[PDB]
Design a protein around this nucleic acid. Structure first.
Ligand SMILES: Nc1ccn([C@H]2CC[C@@H](COP(=O)(O)OP(=O)(O)OP(=O)(O)O)O2)c(=O)n1
Length: 549
DNA sequence: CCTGACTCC
DNA sequence: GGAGTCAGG
């Protein structure tokens, strides 16, 4: 039971200075995607608008871009970007229910209005998947069924804003939402829409040469193996290694023999085929993911790739990057690192600028553990612990004796008693409170932390150790991003952000601005928050992302 | 569609 | 510790 007006045209009462707004983009990847419908809920009533009509209306477009007309939405970035592709600016977004839900509890995995409403027992709205359907059945339903959904979603947002803000305020997270995540969302929207330009000629040439080399390595493997098999099948590979060649089985998973990189490396003294296999799988991933996969999503006319930064997914407060993922482009082996030569500025006589925090997580450990020996070390400017590594895990990682690994860790805690203290204290806090928190009050709940089951419990305790560290770094670089764009905009530099990579920011700019960026960027990033230790940032620029080192 | 690869922070 | 994509099955 909910009345609404199926409008044939926009009226003045639709354009109030506060509204719940739904700009519906049904395709998961919203870049250049259709807007299938619009809904507005305000003091005056509920309205559905056809996008052809509304978006072609100069008064509705004006309202959309008016910062003083406040909108409450769910996933405003999706809307803001889809509107950019329609040549329309979205302003005045004051509340995002997606981001509010994420801050309240990231484990709920809220990705539609219905799921957010569930957190307040609000039931007068359907899940999106139930309206549109799954997979090949996915479709926009008949207008009256569509219109009712969009309106119900707007009505839900309208009624849920204050209950959500009230709870955020109770948790002291309202500023985290309004001053950080919400402004970050607009910045991410800008980055996504700008995209990153790709040198397809170079990428395609790399692909051709990689293909030849895969063939050569492939044949060499079959020769060493004494047989042809699918190297990309862990199962067939297992038979070759552990049955035909009779190499030792160092690890098994629930499906059979492990052929992990760690395991194969340890088998190098037994047979020279394992090294070749490792090489083959490296090359094949470069080809399948960073040449072919990347070329598939390049927009041919502009040669740009447009990632989507998921702001409400990770359990720690980090972003993730999808379709394509630009936060896992190779760098560690020169062979893969060369992929970065294909990422270039979007304008002639521009350069790529790259700035990275040095050891941000170990410094956060220092700051939050208040370890003197660790803080003193950073003031002189002089990881496994941070992930809760065992003696076993460390022995294996370093391929050394466990006794020696265990002694390394025991020594470590003896040497850093304040870190050892933090670890014990943060776990105890998690057990007492049921959640851990970050510098800017991001939380993660850990309902398993008192499980009687050793493995379940242990994993939870490790999360208690790590999340405040990783999450606090996420908080910092996010703050650094918001401040940076402000510092860029005032002094009207043309430079703009392209990418964030966890503890790194990647920009493009006219070559003329490099000197000013060498000053501005590292400063802003270091002055993002003030810790007990100093924040350090390294920076480079160059003709391509590769050269920015 | 899941698992186990390789990739980053 | 936190992520995404890919091929095989
Ligand atoms: N209503 C609030 C209050 C705080 N915060 C987040 C944003 C910044 C961070 C700092 O909190 P402050 O009040 O400025 O410092 P504090 O009180 O000393 O924080 P803490 O309780 O952790 O010591 O917390 C928030 O999101 N919403």
């Amino acid at each position: 039971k909910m009345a609404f007006t199926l409008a044939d045209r926009v009226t003045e009462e639709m354009l109030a200075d506060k509204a719940a707004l739904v700009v519906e983009v049904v395709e998961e990847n919203y870049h250049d995607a259709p807007i299938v419908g619009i809904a507005v809920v305000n003091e005056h009533g509920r309205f559905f608008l056809r996008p052809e009509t509304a978006l072609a209306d100069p008064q509705f477009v004006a309202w959309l871009g008016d910062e003083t007309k406040k909108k409450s939405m769910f996933d405003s970035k999706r809307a803001a970007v889809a509107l950019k592709w329609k040549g329309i600016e979205l302003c005045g977004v004051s509340f995002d229910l997606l981001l509010a839900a994420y801050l309240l509890d990231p484990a709920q995995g809220v990705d539609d209005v219905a799921a957010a409403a569930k957190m307040k027992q609000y039931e007068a709205v359907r899940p999106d998947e139930a309206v549109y359907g799954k997979g090949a059945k996915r479709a926009v339903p008949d207008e009256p069924v569509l219109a009712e959904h969009l309106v119900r979603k707007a009505a839900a947002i309208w009624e849920l804003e204050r209950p959500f803000l009230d709870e955020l305020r109770r948790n002291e997270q309202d500023r985290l939402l309004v001053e950080l995540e919400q402004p970050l969302s607009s910045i991410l929207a800008e980055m996504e829409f700008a995209g990153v330009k790709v040198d397809t000629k170079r990428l395609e040439q790399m692909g051709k040469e990689l293909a030849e080399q895969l063939g050569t390595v492939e044949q060499r493997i079959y020769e060493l193996a004494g047989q042809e098999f699918n190297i990309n099948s862990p199962k067939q590979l297992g038979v070759i290694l552990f049955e035909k060649l009779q190499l030792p089985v160092l690890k098994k998973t629930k499906t059979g023999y492990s052929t992990s990189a760690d395991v194969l490396e340890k088998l190098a003294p037994y047979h020279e085929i394992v090294e070749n296999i490792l090489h083959y799988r490296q090359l094949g991933k470069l080809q399948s993911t960073y040449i072919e996969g990347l070329l598939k999503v390049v927009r041919p006319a502009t040669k740009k790739v447009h990632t989507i930064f998921n702001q409400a997914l990770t359990q720690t407060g980090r972003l993730s990057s999808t379709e394509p993922n630009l936060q896992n482009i190779p760098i560690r082996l020169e062979e893969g690192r060369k992929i970065r030569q294909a990422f270039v500025p979007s304008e002639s006589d521009w350069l790529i600028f790259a700035a990275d925090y040095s050891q941000i997580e170990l410094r956060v450990l220092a700051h939050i553990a208040e370890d003197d020996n660790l803080m003193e070390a950073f003031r002189r400017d002089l990881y496994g612990i941070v992930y809760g590594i065992s003696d076993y895990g460390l022995a294996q990682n370093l391929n050394i004796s466990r006794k020696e690994a265990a002694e390394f860790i025991e020594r470590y805690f003896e040497s850093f008693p304040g870190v050892k203290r933090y670890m014990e204290n943060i776990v105890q806090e998690a057990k007492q409170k049921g959640y851990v928190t970050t510098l800017l009050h991001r939380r993660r709940y850990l309902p398993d932390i008192t499980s009687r089951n050793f493995n379940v419990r242990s994993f939870a305790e490790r999360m208690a150790m790590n999340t405040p560290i990783q999450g606090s770094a996420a908080d910092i670089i996010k703050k650094a991003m918001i401040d940076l764009n402000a510092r860029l905009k005032e002094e009207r530099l043309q430079a703009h952000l392209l990418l964030q990579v966890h503890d790194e920011l990647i920009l493009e700019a006219p070559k003329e601005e490099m000197e000013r960026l060498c000053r501005l960027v590292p400063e802003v990033m270091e002055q993002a928050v003030t810790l007990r230790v100093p924040l350090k940032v390294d920076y480079h620029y160059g003709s391509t992302w590769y050269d920015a080192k």
